[PDB]
């Protein structure tokens, strides 16, 4: 009956079910980021030589560079039977509010975590922008999530790579005192009552200070049938469908503006609720957010299920044993080199009694003198002089160093190429496109294009707030993956160049060259060139 | 060695040593800021006492110190232990800079 009890039971079940993978991923992150000598728990250990002769890090760097050289971004394409330019507005909005540094950094962080540990993630948020808004005085920004394995917890009964069938997800935010204070200020929380939640990170390296304040954000999506209103468009057209949860404060202003209700239908849809919780209380209960999907997008490496249990792997998990063995063998060899008596002779003291300054190591003598006679034994016994044997690296040590290095080299090969990881990233970006499209349809002002212009049908309430009006014909574009472009003009230039590269030198070649000149950025000389191209294009009909 | 001198003469046989705290008196303490320091080390997570426990950091408010929050569990008596250990040492590096004010030192 308790909301807190239900939420905590769900979170406890999911956190328990996802324990092995989280621990392995955290170990991989620590091993491949901080130090390969992960012996914090080892007790009764004195201090000896512990070298780090890394051979896995260059492989990770090479894979990261290879996936950095090929950026991937969403590409909206019109559906089958829809208008040829049904995706221009959505694509332009997506590029406009995803061209910023934050989106690129979040994607790079997710990719690096996917390569190293095996799982990464990022998030989409909506903010109020007043200077440069994308639409409806709002912007959508993609933010990174660090250590997704331990910070983002999904539903246990989710058998999809992108978690599009999971219904809840808890994100653990950890901060210091100032971070908690500003978090409370942002979210209208109570700053004095310090929160607490499950600690997601372990104390391994001698860090003086770790995160102290913990909190959780629980996202839940509910699919239900809600009443939809079928109004009649007074500006131009035929009925437009609006939901009843929105169009609430303007439910009487639509009639004044000229919308006449025609019928009423029930339509099934998904709504997302966020709750800010701690270990003992619920701070925010069911705050509805924008979109039909949980705004967290995960990226996976080698992902699968073993027995009702998720396993995800990167490129570092299977090299750890060989790398640790190599480090241990090298440390042992360094110990052998350092703490070993050198090659020096063995002497009875009476053999060199009186000549001990000849063997000190100078070069003032032509030869070394040794005593011969003993007053009691007559003569000194004769024996071949012995020398301490020089230090030697054992054959076992050399063979195992070579074998461990060979094993690590053999096993640290992602694929043959990073094609599978790039495909998983593409799947993540397709999920990102879906989520962004839902959020845009929920908050943005999407104009409708008619074949008779763009008709922005909007209205305001008595409280001066603007309420968006969107017809149910909103999924006119499906999701694909293409090269990452910073703007629609850049994408157009790329498309024109690609078409030109395949068109032979005919009249379409001239047309495409003039088009490329038309779509060029402006200076002064290029301004003149583009003006000439525009004049030619217009004069050619 | 003489460059480090701080007193005019040395103790010469029967020098009378006068005590300067004659009465009970709550102190007033003045110092230079660098005369007192606090040396702090979090207890290592591999310490023989904190062996079977799962240790984490634990910041102390106000003062700039961090101790160890350790925790262990028991099956047979289905119970648990927690332990906050703070390791620190107050060191007076310049006692000649530290001072004490004693009022009401009447006979």
Curated annotation (Swiss-Prot), chain A:
Changing residue 60 to A/T/M: Overpackaging. GO terms for cellular component: viral portal complex. Its main location: virion. Keywords: Capsid protein, Late protein, Viral capsid assembly, Viral genome ejection through host cell envelope, Viral genome packaging, Viral penetration into host cytoplasm, Viral release from host cell, Viral short tail ejection system, Virion, Virus entry into host cell. The keyword rRNA-binding does not apply. The keyword Lyase does not apply. Transmembrane segments: none annotated. It is found in: Virion. GO terms for biological process: symbiont genome ejection through host cell envelope, short tail mechanism; viral DNA genome packaging; viral DNA genome packaging, headful; virion assembly. Forms the portal vertex of the capsid. This portal plays critical roles in head assembly, genome packaging, neck/tail attachment, and genome ejection. Procapsid assembly may initiate with a nucleation complex composed of portal and scaffolding proteins. The portal protein multimerizes as a single ring-shaped homododecamer arranged around a central channel. Switches upon genome packaging from an asymmetrical conformation in the procapsid (PC-portal) to a symmetrical ring in the mature capsid (MV-portal). This change of conformation may serve as a signal for headful packaging. Belongs to the p22likevirus portal protein family. Homododecamer. Interacts with the terminase large subunit; this interaction allows the packaging of viral DNA. Interacts (via C-terminus) with the head-to-tail adapter protein gp4; this interaction participates in the head completion. Interacts with the scaffolding protein; this interaction initiates procapsid assembly, thereby ensuring incorporation of only one portal ring per capsid. Interacts with the capsid protein. This is Portal protein. The lineage of its organism: Viruses, Duplodnaviria, Heunggongvirae, Uroviricota, Caudoviricetes. The gene is 1. The chain holds residues 5 to 580 of 725 of the full protein.
Swiss-Prot record, chain B:
One of its GO terms (molecular function) is identical protein binding. Interacts (via N-terminus) with the capsid assembly scaffolding protein (via C-terminus); capsid proteins and scaffolding proteins form building blocks that assemble to form the procapsid. Interacts with the portal protein. Keywords: Capsid protein, Late protein, T=7 icosahedral capsid protein, Virion. One of its GO terms (biological process) is viral procapsid maturation. Changing residue 54 to A: No effect on phage growth. This is Major capsid protein. Self-assembles to form an icosahedral capsid with a T=7 symmetry. The insertion domain (I domain) plays an important role in the folding of the capsid protein by acting as an intramolecular chaperone. The gene is 5. The keyword RNA-binding does not apply. Changing residue 62 to A: No effect on phage growth. It comes from the Viruses. GO terms for cellular component: T=7 icosahedral viral capsid; viral capsid; viral procapsid. It comes from Salmonella phage P22. The chain holds residues 324 to 430 of 430 of the full protein. Transmembrane segments: none annotated. The keyword GTP-binding does not apply. It is found in: Virion. Belongs to the P22 phage major capsid protein family.
